[model samples]
Target chain A: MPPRILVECLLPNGMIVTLECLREATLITIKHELFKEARKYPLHQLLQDESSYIFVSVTQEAEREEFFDETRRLCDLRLFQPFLKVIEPV
Target chain B: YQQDQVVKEDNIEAVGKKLHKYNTQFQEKSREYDRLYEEYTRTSQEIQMKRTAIEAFNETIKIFEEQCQTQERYSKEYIEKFKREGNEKEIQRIMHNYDKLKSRISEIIDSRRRLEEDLKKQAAEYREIDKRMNSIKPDLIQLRKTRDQYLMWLTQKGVRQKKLNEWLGN
Candidate 1:
């Protein structure tokens, strides 16, 4: 068994999936692993979007802190797709 | 899942009113007991004064008798007439004085005892009100917190639904 990396795996359906990542697995290796898996989205799409509006909440931070806290409460490991937001350097 | 989309509403101010009423009743009962304690203190003072007057009268009778006995040894006429009259008046005066004084004293004592009893009763009422009032407050706090959480969850869910609808052009 290859040793595990402990990186935060952003899940699909909005859950982070850092539960099984190994320490030895580099960022490139994790990307490859995600591609091999059936549930993760395509890498190039994750590389092209600037959709960080989903997490830091591009809507209203000052007026709605409790709403932000509630959203932060949702930590299930199924909503991650790093390729959906992470952009490839042109 | 169909009913899950419902948006619940509640009056935060009404909840606050209920909490205020609870504390008002609690403090009212506490003040009632404190007032009774003050009455008890006044009654005790009254009883103490009556007891002191009775003791002073007894001391005066003793001194008067000693003076009369010494005077008779020197001049019998002055002493003899005074002994009968003086003793008679002292006995009569004291008999009524002690009787009325003792009765009044007992009444005051009893009243104070009764007031103390009232104090205990009111204390119990105060504690009961305080406990019940304190218990209700936590429920109000929990309700407000829970309501806020429910509202937040609904608002976020509504936004998500709106975005989805707009994307589909529904």
Candidate 2:
């Protein structure tokens, strides 16, 4: 089984979802996962729109440096706990 | 056959007149008691209503505080995340959330301030009602006592008059 990183995600309904995301995933890759996981929106639409606004954040300085690049892997981020905003921004 | 049943210096006419005066005083005093009792009841009811309103206000404040805390927590996370990226739209998005949360908190606080003032006023009124009732308490008791004393005097005078009528017949 692939190791997972525990993270929190925010939905449009203002509810927070705490889930285990694959450590090897990227910001864009998480969107693809959401396609299968959430099934609320199309993967194509998430990529095509700039305002779909999915981002990950960590409180640790070392982890921040690791995921400083937007395309870095969740494993590269070195996060104990991560918080990500997933908004279908209006 | 009681003492002083014979003719006395203070005649029956004077005694009857005094009784009449005391009866008028009793009527006035009883009315005053009724008014004070009603005022006490009205003030108590008002205090109760104010307390109920305060309870509701405090409860609503608790609910709004929870919402404010939840949103602020989300905003802080978003702020730190977007600030790092330095993306204009991203920063705006989270800032907007923070601003909205702050404004909502301000509105709740402002409403509570007005309600707190109302509570203060009602509390003061409650104290005043207590004072008023206490101040009038002695007067109400005294009035009842004076009326009872007057009744006793009238009863004694009535017996004396009945005896005098018999003595005059004799």
Candidate 3:
């Protein structure tokens, strides 16, 4: 069993929604859950722009390498949920 | 001690070094990440195959056990009937039939036992491999994040360098 981690999603409508998911859940799974909740009305627009979404996480303040790897689990990542940003494709 | 030339050159040089170091580490980590991902995929596929094999083994074993039970019942009835009767020839025929069934059942039981043991071993192996893969995932994630940050920093640094070059040309 994976540990539960807090997830924060920055919605396009300027709302910051926080939720919890298993740490082993991949980014795709997390994104799907967000879309599922946001589109509870069924007619809601889907966030289909794969390139538009970027998962960012902050860890060490020193010399670092990358922001996010989608295949990684939340527990495995050195992430900062507060800095989460969603870019909507124009 | 000129502010524009000496300090700017040093600053550019420092950032350049950082960018270089970051790129090297990022590339190495990315390679490792890719390898780990590939291994994970292969491991998952292997586990699925093992699971399928185990299912088949179980089904085959169930069938064999049912057949053995039927054979046992028939053998017992034949032996009991022979005990109650007095025809030597009829008794030998019944004994022959019972012996054949009993041997066949014994063979099946041994084969089933071997398959069950193999299934158990494979299951344990699958679990161990899966656990090991999960344990390494955190390191993979960390490496990926580090690589991405390095690439992002280098991109920003590139833009800064272009701007500085333009400023120097002015």
User: What C-alpha lDDT values do all the predictions have?
Assistant: 0.38, 0.55, 0.52
User: Between 1 and 3, whose TM-score is larger?
Assistant: 3
**Model 1: how far residue B158 lies from native, Å:** 9.0
Instruction: Tell me how candidate 2 scores on lDDT.
Output: 0.55
Model 3 off-target regions past 4 Å?
A1-90, B1-9, B33-43, B68-90, B157-170
TM-score of each: 0.28, 0.49, 0.42
- State the TM-score of candidate 2 restricted to chain B: 0.64
lDDT of 1 by residue, B50-69 (tens): 44433433333333233334
In candidate 2, what are the lDDT values of residues B93-159, reduced to their tens digit?
A: 5456456545654775777688678768867876776777677667667755765665565556545
Model 2 steric clash pairs: none
| Regions more than 4 Å wrong, model 2 | A1-90, B1-10, B77-94, B156-170
Give the candidate number with the greatest DockQ. 2
Q: Is candidate 2 or candidate 3 better by DockQ?
A: 2
User: What fnat does each of the candidate structures reach?
Assistant: 0.00, 0.00, 0.00
lDDT (Cα, tens digit) per residue for candidate 3, span A11-36: 44323345678878877678667667
Across B58-94, the per-residue lDDT of candidate 3 in tens digits comes to 4433433443454455446555665577656655654
Better of 2 and 3 by TM-score: 2
Count of clashes, each model: 21, 0, 7
Residue A86 in model 2: lDDT: 48
Interface RMSD of each: 47.9, 15.7, 29.6
User: After best superposition, candidate 2 residue B13: deviation in angstroms?
Assistant: 3.4
* Model 1 lDDT, residue B54, Cα: 37
